[PDB]
Specification:
Four copies of one chain form a homotetramer. In chain A, α3 packs across α6 (about 190-210) and α12 packs parallel to α16. By secondary structure, the first copy, chain A, is an alpha/beta fold. Chain A is globular, with a radius of gyration of 23 Å. Among the domains of chain A are: about 45-55 and about 225-360, Rossmann fold; about 60-215, no CATH class. Chain A is about 35% helix and about 15% strand. The interface between A and B is large, with 44 and 44 residues. β15 of chain A pairs antiparallel with β11 (about 190) of chain C. The structure holds bromide ion (BR) (4 copies) and magnesium ion (MG) (4 copies). The PDB classes it as hydrolase.
């Protein structure tokens, strides 16, 4: 049962809009909105959205598998060995937010301080002592972006698995000699860095020039979560504020996906007339090029929504009904909607490019969608015995045979997958967890969870006190 | 009673080295080490130090006043008006960590997200609504380093006050016309940005070319905290590990200051032979040029400790007894001392250049000295009624006349000074507080507080859980 | 009669290899090699070539017209108006080396000091006084690369004409309002800068993603000069030294073009066995990415010449017979061929990326192919009366009615085309001329002209003396 | 007899202002203005000047010797060996425009293409074959500014000699071991690069913080050429146009030097009232920071000419009589004087920062002062036999024992000094010569030579024709 199975199960249920029914539904962890910083919903005058993995949640593991297959096929097409075609995507291996070390060809799970929590070379999980040879301080400088690449998006899941597949394949293929920084095939040397660049380039190619979009749109039921509560929630937002879309995707793809998301024989509620998806938005902006969007952006263009092409020229005019924009900047949105930053709740899945930058550069309020949480929360409550045993052990230790701590940490972690929880390894929080806490005001498995709280709701987090204040 | 009066009072007391006496002394907030992340002291094999405001704690407000006077005198010498000479340093105005906005000439106290907590134009404290004209979202982009300068060092205290003095002076002097971005004097226009640059340049000049060092060394009792427990603590560190100095200051100044710090008619304990300060260190490095030090650094040089000048050439040799180094990098230290990052406790006062960079770039353990805490802690326990009333009010509010919250916030804040606590304004934490929590493993008013804990001590912080884990 | 008609006429003639016949043939301007700096041919141990417009000389105006048509079609496909399809390439308009001013939308012909010689806005040639409003000093800063783009390649000929067509079209189309920096179409504004970027992007697209290569290879007789003397000359070079190819083009295109260039029912001379084109080269390098090639370059790769794809890995091995390389650097060539810079004669058409950089960065000897010279030389000798009259007028003037100088300058210039000679306007030399003189040791309409000189030939230029030395 | 002895001899003669006397005087090479590009003097509406080595020509070798002595003294003061004090400036060694190779510690004289003409390691002149080990292609990449420093100013003369003295000293001092890239003194290694940086820093220090200016102003007769014809020429310029000063020097130094230059018991001509130097200028600008001046510059400031300090603020007002400016940009000058670039003749000695940038960035007309020409011209006419013999030999060779060419080249070169003529080595022109030809419209040993031509004079250079045009 994948996280998207959980989401689709919840999506299939019609909304019970009775106040006590809603209040009772959000008592369950699965349907809750979680709060890092207090947020008075009455102060929000604008709700903004990304599309991919926010409005359009791609089903798992089918979508990652398609991405994986197409990326493999591209690498074979440019000259990688035929044996790559025997790889098959395995959803139990990758966890999001891992760091690929291009020097030594390892996937690393790290905390917020760059300390190593997990290290795998191909499919070999390297134990603590063996890690010291390459990482003498069990530490990486994570801002050394020439060396380290952080795989923090859901689109990076297939390449995370593919990197480990390739390191495994080359290591075990007798044609190649394994060296510290790559593989020797006689007079050819393939560094892990060059191999990584080929994989990154191929994923980009699949998305931007290959058939991923085409294959997705040909079978939207297979690939995209559909929820009749989506139009309902967006209609309620528009009754109390303005609603906008700001997506990096192009208009033609956006229109296909959004049309499917709204394709029900009714509008917001059963029995109401169906309305086109564009009617749910005060402002629609495509080709946003986030994160640059939150600084200088690019010139504001107007989409000819008949031809799907850009009108020639920079658009200098006002916000009008039926206009679709392309490019621009976060300031365009603010100015056109008459909004200040703190009036905006921006809802997206990109912990860096969406949520971090909108918060740091503009002071927008943020809602982070974390699709994996829909399954991680099930594991967390099912296996709470293991975590509680770890707490008790960490407590008893502070005052001999702490191999027990390592073993319980392992058993706990394996419940989430080979690379453990997105949010921790045992008692140590990941970089990803720390970034969520720091930059997401609110977070949840889905933004649809906002449906279960009234719009006057005050989301509350406890005040933080320093050690000397306590 | 200044924070340095508190420190010197504590410094005057001889150490009672009985185990129960030590254990009882660190029960008091004033003598405690505070813990952001757990730290097993038995794992530390090297203790590293900065000099200024760490080993050599400059007395307040005398030292800031000297800096202020010399900076004023430099500005008058280059052509600023004679009226500047009537300014007098006021220690009740500046709090460390304020942001000077060079566009509008305001000092701002901000939280970690750039939200405005306090705004003053000269000596006029601007209320919330009047702030909206210049800061529509009550927010600044703090990484816009062309516009904003963050005054986060103790050496920045005099310029913090001086900026406000100058904005006040020019505003009220009939020769100048106040404009949005500076002052017009007929055919001359002085922007706040140019005025800020002159002040920054003059502070630099005072430190590097003027008489600040000379005036300091002429009266070390007036300007520098002296504590017989300093040699005792450093001797105990050297019994269990290596000790090093890495200072941006030059050897001639370092030698004067350190000689004074160790000038007692005894060594570590009363009755022991006096030993030269250099004997307390396994490695002494001057001219460190931190923060660059924690990346590429500069070439390693050797000090001729007789002439005080650098020997010609890059030093290629080993760590030898009696050698003093200049420049180099953090890697030099690690290699020469045979240390990995996590083996090192680095003790300093610069929350950015010392503590942030050693943690982020190298994974060193960190101890932040915060001299103001020695007085802030007294205010915090004396006026705990006001804070507790604020908690109660914030609680009751969450479920009308919240002018009461603003008033109590003001009365609380004014107990610390005109710009409030270093760590908060009312219930909102400052940027500085957030940076301490994030990058200082341990912190205290003085590193001497380590004397009251055994070297096997396990400093403990509670584990952090995300909202969905709780 | 185009310059490529002249070249093909000369190409059709078999070589008369009698020494007196050769000596007599190079007496004619058309078949001469011109000399800017003395060059002893006996010191050359390696001959290096670019492909495009050097070995493969594209016929004119057919090739420029194809490029033009495809670029227009791309712009219409992305949303430019249908009226663009009525444009037709005119070879009488563009001269190579013009500067597009993106601020004001003018094509400019300039001297080496940035002084204006010709200015056209669309098809309107702007006279001297009217030029002063936009160019107060009749001067541009040609290194302001954000504003000015220098159209110095033969591939830039179609876009040179297309820019002028578009400025004309928009100016005269009643839908748009002409402004100083572009065109207003209601709420859309198209700056000349944005229009220029669309044209540049479309030319790139045609070459790299569109059908230009495909259409070229489908009709090589229409598009490419073929000369049986090419194999003869290259065979003679290989008897006295090494021969290499270093092309930015990919192997698949290179192989098609080169196969056609060598497709005769004989080898070097009539009656000899045909040999594959690759046999004429000691080293073949594709994907060179000049000008970067002359600095750090990219990693050296090996082409699988069966699949046409790159082998995986960096190539670490020696120069072997039958190997084809991709990427690398100029140092790769030198090292693999055992050559020093001055041992190499590098033959190409790119006055910047080939010839300038090989000379300045590596001290290679240079031969610049200037295909237009094959026709310019005919105009120069036919209309020498006009130039001689200009000399006489310039002489008489130096010691009233100099409108005569302007008129004769115009009549002379118009003999070459609307934008005059590549090398001058009247008595003023162009930037392009100055760059040829400075960086081309030797130059000619075709490198085939080397066939008419023996390999011991000493090419001689007169020594340069400063004014004070004369 | 130094070049400044020649200049002062010419300076001592009063001006004979009879038209036939002037016309006859400029017939002599010494008093001529040389012409690279034609310049109609009637089109010049503004004459602009640098001060140092233009208006204020420092006597040789006294001034270079003072610079040398002070630079040596600074290096000894920071820890260089005492033996440096035994060095004594030798004017027969340095020629301007040499390249210091920081990798190998050689001074190189190069042509415009980076080809080696002379190589010296310390005082050892390295012959052609021995040069090949370090320079395999007898070539350097002169834009590799990390490695090569071009000593092209008259202020660089003392450091040119000092670099060679230091390489000689360290090579021959038994304490140091000579290595390929510097000197080893046990555990210290001094690279040529670090040694070069210390010398460069010390020259800067002497000029900006040391006693060079003070020692100069204490004995202006010893150090500065004084010519009663200077006020006469400047007065004549002001009758036909505007006159400005734009100097990097500060006002206090400028005022001392300029006061001395105008200190005669008369004004422009004998018998006229003396006038202050400032009266000769329409605009006076100090602290110019050229070459940045010719781009963005710095903010325009006003000098308080009583206090010598800057008024506070950016100066926003008009050009007024008696105002002195500081900083600004070349555009300030143009706007304030109502000049276009080609209306300005800018007169200076810096072939890069003055003359190159004013020409390339602004299209100003240029007059380069080359003080050494006053003596080089004497050598050129005295030893014309040697050059003529070289021409004849180069001619006879083109159609065996060319050791004769090398010997005559040597004897010729040695007439100018150990590093030969500024402008050539034998028949090969230097980089400096090529830069003069390219960027100086006019040049001379002194700008005073303009006095001998009427202001309607048309300076004529012959038109340049390409090889194919001839
Ligand atoms: Br699509
Ligand atoms: Br001192
Ligand atoms: Br092709
Ligand atoms: Br002075
Ligand atoms: Mg990378
Ligand atoms: Mg600033
Ligand atoms: Mg451009
Ligand atoms: Mg250098």
């Amino acid at each position: 049962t994948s996280w998207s199975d959980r989401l689709q199960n919840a999506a299939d249920m019609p909304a019970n809009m009775d106040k006590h029914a809603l209040k009772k539904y959000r008592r369950e962890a699965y349907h809750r909105v979680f709060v890092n910083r207090s947020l008075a919903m009455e102060k929000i005058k604008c709700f903004g959205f990304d599309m991919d993995y926010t409005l359009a949640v791609y089903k798992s593991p089918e979508y990652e598998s398609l991405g994986f297959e197409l990326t493999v096929e591209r690498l074979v097409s440019i000259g990688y060995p035929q044996e790559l075609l025997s790889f098959a995507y395995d959803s139990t291996f990758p966890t999001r937010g891992l760091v690929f070390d291009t020097l030594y060809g390892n996937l690393l799970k790290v905390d917020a301080y760059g300390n190593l929590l997990v290290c795998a070379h191909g499919f070999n999980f390297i134990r603590g002592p063996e890690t010291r040879e390459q990482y003498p301080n069990k530490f990486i400088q994570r801002d050394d972006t020439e060396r380290f690449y952080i795989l923090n998006t859901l689109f990076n899941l297939p390449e995370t698995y593919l990197l480990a597949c390739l390191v495994d394949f080359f290591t075990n293929c007798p044609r190649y000699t394994s060296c510290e920084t790559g593989f020797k095939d006689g007079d050819l040397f393939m560094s892990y860095r060059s191999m990584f660049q080929d994989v990154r380039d191929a994923v980009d190619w699949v998305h931007y020039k290959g058939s991923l979009k085409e294959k997705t749109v040909e079978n939207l039921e297979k690939y995209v979560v559909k929820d009749g509560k989506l139009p309902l929630l967006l209609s309620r937002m528009k009754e109390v504020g303005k609603v906008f879309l700001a997506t990096n995707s192009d208009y033609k793809y956006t229109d296909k996906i959004m049309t499917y998301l709204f394709d029900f024989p009714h509008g917001p509620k059963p029995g109401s007339s169906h309305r086109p998806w564009q009617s749910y938005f005060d402002l629609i902006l495509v080709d946003a090029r986030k994160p640059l969007f939150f600084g200088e952006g690019t010139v504001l263009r107007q989409v000819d929504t008949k031809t799907g092409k850009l009108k020639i020229g920079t658009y200098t005019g006002p916000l009008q009904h039926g206009i679709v924009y392309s490019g621009g900047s976060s300031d365009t949105i603010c100015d056109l909607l008459g909004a200040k930053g703190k009036d905006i709740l921006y809802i997206g899945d990109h912990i860096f490019g969406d949520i971090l930058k909108s918060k740091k550069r503009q002071g927008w309020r943020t809602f982070l969608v974390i699709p994996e949480l829909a399954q991680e929360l099930h594991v967390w409550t099912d296996k709470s015995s293991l975590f509680e045993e770890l707490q008790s052990l960490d407590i008893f230790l502070a005052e001999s045979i702490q191999r027990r701590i390592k073993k319980v940490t392992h058993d706990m972690d394996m419940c989430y997958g080979m690379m453990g929880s997105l949010f921790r390894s045992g008692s140590r929080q990941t970089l990803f967890a720390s970034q969520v806490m720091r930059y997401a005001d609110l977070y949840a498995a889905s933004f649809i969870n906002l449906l279960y709280y009234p719009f006057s709701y005050l989301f509350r987090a406890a005040h933080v006190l320093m050690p000397h204040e306590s």
